[PDB]
Amino acid sequence: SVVIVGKISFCPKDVLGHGAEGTIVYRGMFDNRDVAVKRILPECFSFADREVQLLRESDEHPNVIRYFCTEKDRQFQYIAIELCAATLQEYVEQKDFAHLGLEPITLLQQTTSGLAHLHSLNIVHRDLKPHNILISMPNAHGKIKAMISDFGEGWIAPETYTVDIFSAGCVFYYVISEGSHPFGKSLQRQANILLGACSLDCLHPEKHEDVIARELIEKMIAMDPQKRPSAKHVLKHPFFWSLEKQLQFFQDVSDRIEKESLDGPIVKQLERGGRAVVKMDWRENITVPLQTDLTYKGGSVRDLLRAMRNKKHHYRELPAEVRETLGSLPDDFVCYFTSRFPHLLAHTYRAMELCSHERLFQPYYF
Amino acid sequence: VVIVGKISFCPKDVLGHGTIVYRGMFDNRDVAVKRILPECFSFADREVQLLRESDEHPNVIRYFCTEKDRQFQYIAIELCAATLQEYVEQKDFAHLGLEPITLLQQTTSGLAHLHSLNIVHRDLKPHNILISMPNAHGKIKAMISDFGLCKKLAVGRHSFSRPGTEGWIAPEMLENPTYTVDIFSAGCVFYYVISEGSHPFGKSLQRQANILLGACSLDCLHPEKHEDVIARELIEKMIAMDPQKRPSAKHVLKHPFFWSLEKQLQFFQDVSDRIEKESLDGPIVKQLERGGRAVVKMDWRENITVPLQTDLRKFRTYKGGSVRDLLRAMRNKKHHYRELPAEVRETLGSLPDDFVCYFTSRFPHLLAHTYRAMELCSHERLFQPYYFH
Numbered sequence: 001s002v003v004i005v006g007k008i009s010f011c012p013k014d015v016l017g018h019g020a021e022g023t024i025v026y027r028g029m030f031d032n033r034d035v036a037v038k039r040i041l042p043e044c045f046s047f048a049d050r051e052v053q054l055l056r057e058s059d060e061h062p063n064v065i066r067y068f069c070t071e072k073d074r075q076f077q078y079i080a081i082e083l084c085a086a087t088l089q090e091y092v093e094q095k096d097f098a099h100l101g102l103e104p105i106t107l108l109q110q111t112t113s114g115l116a117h118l119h120s121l122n123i124v125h126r127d128l129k130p131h132n133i134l135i136s137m138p139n140a141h142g143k144i145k146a147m148i149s150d151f152g153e154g155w156i157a158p159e160t161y162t163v164d165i166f167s168a169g170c171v172f173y174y175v176i177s178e179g180s181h182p183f184g185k186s187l188q189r190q191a192n193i194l195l196g197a198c199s200l201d202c203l204h205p206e207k208h209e210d211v212i213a214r215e216l217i218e219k220m221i222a223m224d225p226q227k228r229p230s231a232k233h234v235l236k237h238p239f240f241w242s243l244e245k246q247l248q249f250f251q252d253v254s255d256r257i258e259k260e261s262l263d264g265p266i267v268k269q270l271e272r273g274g275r276a277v278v279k280m281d282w283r284e285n286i287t288v289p290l291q292t293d294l295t296y297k298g299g300s301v302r303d304l305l306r307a308m309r310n311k312k313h314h315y316r317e318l319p320a321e322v323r324e325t326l327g328s329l330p331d332d333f334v335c336y337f338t339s340r341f342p343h344l345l346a347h348t349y350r351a352m353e354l355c356s357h358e359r360l361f362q363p364y365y366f
Numbered sequence: 367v368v369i370v371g372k373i374s375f376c377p378k379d380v381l382g383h384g385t386i387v388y389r390g391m392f393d394n395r396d397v398a399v400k401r402i403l404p405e406c407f408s409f410a411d412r413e414v415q416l417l418r419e420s421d422e423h424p425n426v427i428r429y430f431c432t433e434k435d436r437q438f439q440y441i442a443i444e445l446c447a448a449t450l451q452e453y454v455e456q457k458d459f460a461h462l463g464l465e466p467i468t469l470l471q472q473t474t475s476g477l478a479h480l481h482s483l484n485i486v487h488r489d490l491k492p493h494n495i496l497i498s499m500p501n502a503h504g505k506i507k508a509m510i511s512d513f514g515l516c517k518k519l520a521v522g523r524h525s526f527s528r529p530g531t532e533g534w535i536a537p538e539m540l541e542n543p544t545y546t547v548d549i550f551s552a553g554c555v556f557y558y559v560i561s562e563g564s565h566p567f568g569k570s571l572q573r574q575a576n577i578l579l580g581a582c583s584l585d586c587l588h589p590e591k592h593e594d595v596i597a598r599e600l601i602e603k604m605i606a607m608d609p610q611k612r613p614s615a616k617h618v619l620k621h622p623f624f625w626s627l628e629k630q631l632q633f634f635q636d637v638s639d640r641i642e643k644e645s646l647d648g649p650i651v652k653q654l655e656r657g658g659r660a661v662v663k664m665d666w667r668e669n670i671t672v673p674l675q676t677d678l679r680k681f682r683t684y685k686g687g688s689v690r691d692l693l694r695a696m697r698n699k700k701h702h703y704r705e706l707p708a709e710v711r712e713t714l715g716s717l718p719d720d721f722v723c724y725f726t727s728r729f730p731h732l733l734a735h736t737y738r739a740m741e742l743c744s745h746e747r748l749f750q751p752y753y754f755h
């Protein structure tokens with residue numbers, strides 16, 4: 001009814017999962033801690049001890065699963081792990097995102113940070129997928145966090161560190177798509193990967209968020225392994241940025257290109273493909289009161305950014321008619337433009353990639 | 367090689383000392399082992415459960431396990447490089463820079479993790495703050511220890527009770543015990559870290575008495591420097607005898623003491639743009655120009671470099687005894703940095719670090735007076751990351 005094996009004790013009725021060569025995972029207890037216990041046969045001992053040593057070497061991190069201890073009996077070996085509420089899989093297939101808002105994005109920042117923690121220790125994750133991503137129990141505030149397991153099927157790369165980026169880029173789309181997969185469904189995930197067939201049609205260029213998600217993932221699931229962002233690179237991507245940071249970025253860019261010549265390498269880079277970004281004439285795409293409150297060129301990103309810089313600067317000096325439509329600072333403010341000009345931040349970010357080494361534009365790139 | 371269960375230790379390797387602490391091993395993990403007599407079980411099992419309840423956090427010491435012997439009880443703890451105390455008495459701060467400041471954010475964050483669980487730390491001193499082993503990068507982190515003196519407040523709020531060691535203790539125990547007690551002890555550790563070992567309430571054998579008396583001395587922090595003031599103002603609030611005048615654990619994390627020069631600057635822009643339409647009799651500026659003459663050294667146009675003084679276009683109409691116009695200068699100088707001549711950019715400094723530093727070196731009370739005076743627009747989301755939540 002309830003086995004006690006050293007400091008690991010569990011009740012078989014409370015079963016959490018069942019897999020591979022006769023392995024069952026229970027809800028047990030270690031030193032009065034709620035833990036998930038996995039019993040394994042001698043066929044998996046040599047493999048088990050290999051994963052375990054890595055846990056000891058990387059459990060220091062929050063976004064890596066915490067290993068406690070292991071004990072062996074006459075027949076089995078039991079492995080103690082921090083009890084977690086659910087997987088990223090159970091979290092997407094059952095839990096509604098309308099009352100979470102900011103939670104899913106946080107899980108990728110966490111997952112990516114923990115995945116980076118392995119890279120700092122010259123470790124390579126190979127089987128990274130939502131069934132392995134673990135969701136922590138609710139804290140006192142009510143917040144949660146993500147943790148990785150299994151440090152070495154559709155999440156596999158066709159081909160090093162760049163491999164984990166491929167798996168992750170598919171996991172990002174998985175959380176965003178509420179269950180879909182960039183390379184199609186099972187029994188075609190492996191094949192389409194070999195071909196290079198991707199489809200992120202859950203992300204349309206008619207919205208700001210979708211584009212910013214595509215640019216990142218396109219790089220990640222890319223055939224060219226060297227064309228994939230490092231783990232810490234992903235974290236300084238606009239995908240995780242706040243509205244305060246989006247706006248202050250536009251401003252740093254706007255003040256930066258004030259003296260740069262129109263024949264400048266940057267402005268050409270910036271105005272290159274601008275017509276689609278500004279929809280030919282941005283004076284027409286915006287509200288009447290603002291349109292009536294405005295040398296700003298329609299096909300100009302630079303003048304568009306110039307308007308945004310100076311209008312915020314003198315926001316308190318603006319009419320009540322405009323302040324209402326422009327939106328309160330800074331959230332609805334930048335949203336007023338990104339909603340209307342979605343490729344802007346993506347285009348701006350990559351076009352200002354030249355000035356990445358500049359100290360004013362380090363916290364955006366690294 | 368002594369072996370008691372899965373925890374094994376070698377007696378020759380003693381880390382500290384009727385409790386003695388050894389260097390042992392748990393499941394091929396490097397751990398610090400403490401041996402206790404049966405007399406200290408009641409305190410230990412109470413201590414361990416708190417570690418069990420809060421070791422999830424990085425800035426809290428990780429408890430692994432304990433084993434029982436014929437005579438003793440052995441407790442396994444994550445091995446740490448050194449204490450904050452050993453860290454101050456031996457390590458030079460000139461080649462670390464922000465590491466010490468980070469140890470306080472870590473320490474403060476871990477203390478908040480306990481406060482999130484309605485816990486009060488009572489025996490807090492640098493000997494309890496532990497320094498993690500170097501990571502692959504070479505970096506470290508701080509972790510709290512010793513929860514023998516820790517109060518698990520039953521429910522929600524209120525205050526209960528009202529003792530080990532001396533000089534780091536709050537007066538409320540010497541009946542008003544709360545989370546803010548940890549702030550007093552913690553606030554004193556800052557001065558210990560900022561200094562080369564010094565303490566706001568004097569040296570040992572009089573730290574205890576002067577606390578009762580209220581004698582504090584932050585003479586290691588003079589208003590002739592920027593950091594000292596921003597540190598003094600914070601610590602002054604933290605070590606305040608008046609317990610309700612003490613910052614919460616989470617507020618301290620949002621104090622200018624931990625801000626970067628980018629945030630000092632990015633804050634000034636938000637402030638200057640905010641007072642753009644404000645009347646001279648405006649409620650915000652009245653608080654701001656209140657005691658401003660001393661902040662700007664009466665006339666700031668005189669205190670700054672020559673090229674800038676000659677680069678201050680007269681059309682803006684800048685008054686000397688006016689702080690807002692000075693902030694306007696920094697705002698207007700920041701906006702058009704690329705439009706300014708190369709002559710000024712050299713003295714003003716490259717953006718944004720040397721730029722804001724150019725003023726703080728000359729105006730240490732600036733960021734302090736502004737932040738303290740700009741508490742009014744705190745509820746506005748443009749002024750959330752500077753104050754609360």
Ligand SMILES: COC(=O)Nc1cccc2c(Oc3ncccc3-c3ccnc(N[C@H]4CCCNC4)n3)c(C)ccc12
Nearest residue numbers: 016017025036038048051079081083084085086132149150
């Ligand atoms: C030697 O290597 C190992 O033994 N590695 C591992 C040991 C232990 C677990 C491990 C583990 O975790 C689980 N594996 C299978 C079923 C359930 C859990 C599990 C673990 C912790 N919490 C929960 N929570 C439940 C709550 C109810 C809904 N389902 C999730 N499940 C993974 C993914 C990988 C390696 C593990």
Ligand SMILES: COC(=O)Nc1cccc2c(Oc3ncccc3-c3ccnc(N[C@H]4CCCNC4)n3)c(C)ccc12
Nearest residue numbers: 381382387398400410413414441443445446447448511512
């Ligand atoms: C639950 O009750 C307990 O038994 N609690 C505790 C158990 C075990 C340790 C505990 C502990 O730890 C130490 N206590 C005294 C001396 C040294 C260490 C110690 C621990 C880990 N690393 C190091 N590093 C050395 C490296 C060489 C230089 N000196 C520092 N020191 C504290 C502070 C509190 C409670 C402990």
